[PDB]
Amino acid sequence: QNITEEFYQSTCSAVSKGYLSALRTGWYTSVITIELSNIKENKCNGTDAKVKLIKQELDKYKNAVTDLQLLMQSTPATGSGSAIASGVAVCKVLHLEGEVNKIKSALLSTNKAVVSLSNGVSVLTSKVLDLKNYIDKQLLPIVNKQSCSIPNIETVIEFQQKNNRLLEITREFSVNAGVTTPVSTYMLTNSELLSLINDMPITNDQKKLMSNNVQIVRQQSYSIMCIIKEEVLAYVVQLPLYGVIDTPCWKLHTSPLCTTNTKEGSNICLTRTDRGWYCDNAGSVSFFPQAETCKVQSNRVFCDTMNSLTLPSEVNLCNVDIFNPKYDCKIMTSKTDVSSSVITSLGAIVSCYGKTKCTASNKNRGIIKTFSNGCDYVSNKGVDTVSVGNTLYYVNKQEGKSLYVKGEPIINFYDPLVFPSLLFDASISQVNEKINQSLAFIRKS
Amino acid sequence: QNITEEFYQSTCSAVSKGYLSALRTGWYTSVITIELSNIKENKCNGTDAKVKLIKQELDKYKNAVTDLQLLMQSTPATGSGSAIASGVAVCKVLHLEGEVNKIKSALLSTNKAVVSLSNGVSVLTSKVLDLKNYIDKQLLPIVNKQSCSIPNIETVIEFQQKNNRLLEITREFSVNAGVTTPVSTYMLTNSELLSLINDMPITNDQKKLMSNNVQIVRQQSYSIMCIIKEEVLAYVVQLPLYGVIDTPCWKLHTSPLCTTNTKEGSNICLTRTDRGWYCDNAGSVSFFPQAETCKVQSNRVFCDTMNSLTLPSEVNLCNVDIFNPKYDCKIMTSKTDVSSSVITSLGAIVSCYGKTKCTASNKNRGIIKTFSNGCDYVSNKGVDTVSVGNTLYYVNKQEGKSLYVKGEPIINFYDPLVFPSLLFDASISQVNEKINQSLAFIRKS
Amino acid sequence: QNITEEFYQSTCSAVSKGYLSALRTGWYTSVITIELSNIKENKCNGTDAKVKLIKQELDKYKNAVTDLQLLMQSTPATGSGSAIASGVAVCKVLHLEGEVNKIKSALLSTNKAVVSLSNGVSVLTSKVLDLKNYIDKQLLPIVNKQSCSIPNIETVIEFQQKNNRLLEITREFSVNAGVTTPVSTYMLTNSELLSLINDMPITNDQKKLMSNNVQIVRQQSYSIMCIIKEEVLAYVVQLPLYGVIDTPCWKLHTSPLCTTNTKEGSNICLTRTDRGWYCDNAGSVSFFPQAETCKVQSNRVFCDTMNSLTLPSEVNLCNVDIFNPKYDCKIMTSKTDVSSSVITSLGAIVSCYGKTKCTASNKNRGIIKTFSNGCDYVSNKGVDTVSVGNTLYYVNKQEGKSLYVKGEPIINFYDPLVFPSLLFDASISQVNEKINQSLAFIRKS
Numbered sequence A, B, C: 001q002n003i004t005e006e007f008y009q010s011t012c013s014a015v016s017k018g019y020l021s022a023l024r025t026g027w028y029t030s031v032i033t034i035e036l037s038n039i040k041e042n043k044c045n046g047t048d049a050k051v052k053l054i055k056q057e058l059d060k061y062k063n064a065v066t067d068l069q070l071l072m073q074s075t076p077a078t079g080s081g082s083a084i085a086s087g088v089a090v091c092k093v094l095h096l097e098g099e100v101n102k103i104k105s106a107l108l109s110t111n112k113a114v115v116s117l118s119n120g121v122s123v124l125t126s127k128v129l130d131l132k133n134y135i136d137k138q139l140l141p142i143v144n145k146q147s148c149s150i151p152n153i154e155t156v157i158e159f160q161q162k163n164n165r166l167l168e169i170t171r172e173f174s175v176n177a178g179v180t181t182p183v184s185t186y187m188l189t190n191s192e193l194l195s196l197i198n199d200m201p202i203t204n205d206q207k208k209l210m211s212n213n214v215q216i217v218r219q220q221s222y223s224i225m226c227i228i229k230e231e232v233l234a235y236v237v238q239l240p241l242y243g244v245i246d247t248p249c250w251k252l253h254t255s256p257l258c259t260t261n262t263k264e265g266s267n268i269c270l271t272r273t274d275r276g277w278y279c280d281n282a283g284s285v286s287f288f289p290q291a292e293t294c295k296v297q298s299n300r301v302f303c304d305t306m307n308s309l310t311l312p313s314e315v316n317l318c319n320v321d322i323f324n325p326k327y328d329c330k331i332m333t334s335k336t337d338v339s340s341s342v343i344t345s346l347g348a349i350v351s352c353y354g355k356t357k358c359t360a361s362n363k364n365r366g367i368i369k370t371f372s373n374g375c376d377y378v379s380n381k382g383v384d385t386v387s388v389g390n391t392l393y394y395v396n397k398q399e400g401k402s403l404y405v406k407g408e409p410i411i412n413f414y415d416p417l418v419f420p421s422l423l424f425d426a427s428i429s430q431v432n433e434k435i436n437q438s439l440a441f442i443r444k445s
């Protein structure tokens, strides 16, 4: 609900609080069928223009079917298949003899129906397009009996419209080797997705959540090609199940913290590592290091726990006491003092070093703050942009409250001569141990 | 105009000169409107095939509108929104009461018109599609008055053509959460983009530049979904403003420089860091470290200063004197002598080590040069390919002149016993300081 | 044929064996032409609805042609053009005067024909669409002679179908600056690709290979825009030639190996580097470090040797003896004991450290194995999932046989006080040399 922020002057880091979690922990697989007709030969001696148009669209249908057939013969084994294994396990069941007839019977009278497969999975199946009925009722009388009947122009247009979804599904599945993500409206219309959300064995609060964030749901779903066999095109849609809901989530922002001496080459730097999204999860903290794995929509984060690390809840103490013995706070060291800025949720961190011109402006007043050398921060209240060198950054104009937590920059507690610079994924105590070892070589002399 | 290159044998690096800059420094936002009709209920008792086709296409229009409505209810907050903040600020203005009516009045008689918003921004708006006029004039008489009028077959076809752009715009905006880049021809036709370039408050030389590189302009633009309200679909197009033009730009290429001793494990390596694009910018140098942030078209580089670092102009002295005290030239060290090649603008750098077979061939003559162990270079004049191990590289056949700058490889100035290997983002003086400290422990003994 | 796996308990690494190679070593370029008509002015005074539809579709054709013209004026020079240089060399030939007429003559009577260009390249050309014949035969009589003839409604529909492929090709080429990959069905239909495979100067076993993996072939192909000139639209399709076939290939999986002491901060870690795909190639080993450069379909790996490194065949000895003097086995060191898992081809590696809950379950029996602290492994026979912390991984259910190679974890052979931690791309002997140097400072005291 309320977004807040905290800048820690001592460590050149900020934490954006108040976000609610939605972490993916399960998969809900569903079978999507398209009833095909298997027509073959069309003896046609008629040259009528309407007949040519029908036979042309019929060839686009036959090629789409043969393309899906050579696509299903080749079964991809790329990546670790660890995130589609649930849907892939369903495709192996669909390949069983008699199994396509079971789903074929349930969708005889209705479009949607729950089916208990021969492996105990009660999947929700769906007949989203019925080409067997259209081709066999409206098209066969036009291309059998030796000479073609003349179809009306409405039929020529109606068949291009119905056949189009088959061709586009074949188009996406061909370039992506049978596995598409996000799931497009051709694979599943918004109307079908929302109806599928309603039919899911989930809570009413979870149906409201997925229905209000369908675009994020599509981006966290998979469409897997199964089999085309016996006048049935089947493919599995894997939708996310968010097992973790409304747990506090926060985003850590970090920026280099160097000393500001006047003789260059005598300065040492330090940067907190593991910036990104953190969410409370089952007595621990789920950390997401990669930037593209979490979508945020209005204070709710939607993450996939597949690309997370599980950390003890004491990892949060790097935000209140970085020198705290319960968790070994990770840092990186260097002597590379290049200016930069980080746009946070409610403001901007600015690390200004050397001769760089760093400033913060309001659109109508101009420069309202000039940063000096070191690491500093400014809230978005009254600030529109931040300029660092030749680069202009826009501050997020989101409502919230920032808190500037003053403190001595910790880089000032380190003697430069014995500082271990050039270390990457190092801990606070690792740096201290290298300092205790470098102090013993001077102790003897 | 004239592309030139310089290979520095001493540092196993090359610089491609003669490129002209175009750096993005501003945004030009523009509002694109599509006039919708808001039709609701269609009482139809007619089963005529033309009437069915019209009602089917009308349902595809109503679903596209409801999809855009649930897309605008959910307002994405992903990334730092720092590069769309200008267009996002316009969407907040469009949400003001009475503001959609202002743009609604200016586009009453013409398609394009400049509008001064209630926040001082004079945006260029555009009515690119008029569905309210088509639906209300050609379609309502067909689906009101209790029984349907029969439309001619030309109307069935004309409505599928007009409604198509709405459906494709809804398709792109749904899978991308309202923010698309590059900007497609559905969001803005080439005809509309070029007319928008002509109508921009920019110089005539800048209009000629953006019009001759429209594909790069699309790739550096954003299309942001605003609001659908009161028979208006509005979305913001953010086009790049290139504040830096025709400044010299150059590309640094680097490759590992190792020693070539005959006993493996006794060799030390060194590689210049910060390879990429450099452009002179406002008395400093704008550096672009990531590879996908700069598009080159005929000697002009098109960069976004958002992903640049601002460096002092002395950074260029690493190209003429790497041991120069005005700038601390950055390197990385190791003992990893694996062969590789870098295809430059006018030739190829080859780092050959161990037993690797390195060569340069002409298509009809065969092998014309065999590289020995170390770092070397060959121009594209007479060379077509370069082979390193089991890999074949093609040399760019672009016209230009290469200059081979001979010099002693600097890795030979380092005593191996005290060389600091295994260092990554290290400076020349950092390595020298580790060498002065390792020489003091031998001095005492 | 038979997939096997080997987990090495001593190094916390696994090797998936039995895969067959298909490495790209060459390019087969081919010219794809679309015959255009160059119609200009359409004097039309008729307001007939069929005439409007024809003139509307004719404007979509003229804009597609002018868009391809401004696309070919701007010739992109992005990337190093090292992987399209073969097709780009063909575009420079097509720009020669008289050269478009040569391909224009061979495709006068047939759709496909081999053409010897004026640079010695015998390319296979193709007339995939004939718009000059359709526009000049069916459309000109409708828009010349001062007043328009009335076309039948079949012609209105037939022209939207034929013109569609031109518009989609223009759509893809515009957003991608003339170079598209993978190659879509609009650039080349599956029917045209398979016919092109049949017409290629390759072995019959190679035609069967590319035809059974057309989707991988598309993903490893390029479509390059050449020229639109003199009623000809020409573009080059670059298809992969797999010069390395059926050589053994294997995939190395690595995971951190730490000590399991009870006092945290007293533990040291080690991880094998260079995980990925290895294939025997011409007496050496071709290594692929990036994850997206190799597609696997049923035991065959399809790699591009462009993004490989050539290593001596002794690199495989890191899998049988990591302490072996023929190859300096690379590792990275640290003290960062965070739990993780790696899903391999036939099982899962689990590195469990600290308080993390690590387990392996069967869908119906529940937890069947609890991992203790250290690095361990489980086969997919009887295991469905592996849980580490708050993350659930799915094991690949592929048939094969795993071999658990027991051995002492090599991290136990290192004295912690003198262990060099914090090293990244370091060799076994590099770590040993840092240990021999740290042992001399204690020897004197």
Ligand SMILES: *[C@@H]1O[C@H](CO)[C@@H](O)[C@H](O)[C@H]1NC(C)=O
Pocket: A429, A432, A433, A436
């Ligand atoms: C460094 O030495 C002091 C004095 O013995 C000790 O109190 C401190 O804990 C040591 N720190 C580390 C990280 O070894």
Ligand SMILES: *[C@@H]1O[C@H](CO)[C@@H](O)[C@H](O)[C@H]1NC(C)=O
Pocket: B429, B432, B433, B436
């Ligand atoms: C190393 O020592 C010499 C001799 O005192 C000095 O002249 C040189 O500048 C030193 N270099 C560094 C990088 O400390």
Ligand SMILES: *[C@@H]1O[C@H](CO)[C@@H](O)[C@H](O)[C@H]1NC(C)=O
Pocket: C429, C432, C433, C436
């Ligand atoms: C370390 O020292 C021993 C004893 O002299 C020697 O046998 C061994 O090979 C040395 N190892 C390295 C990597 O220097």
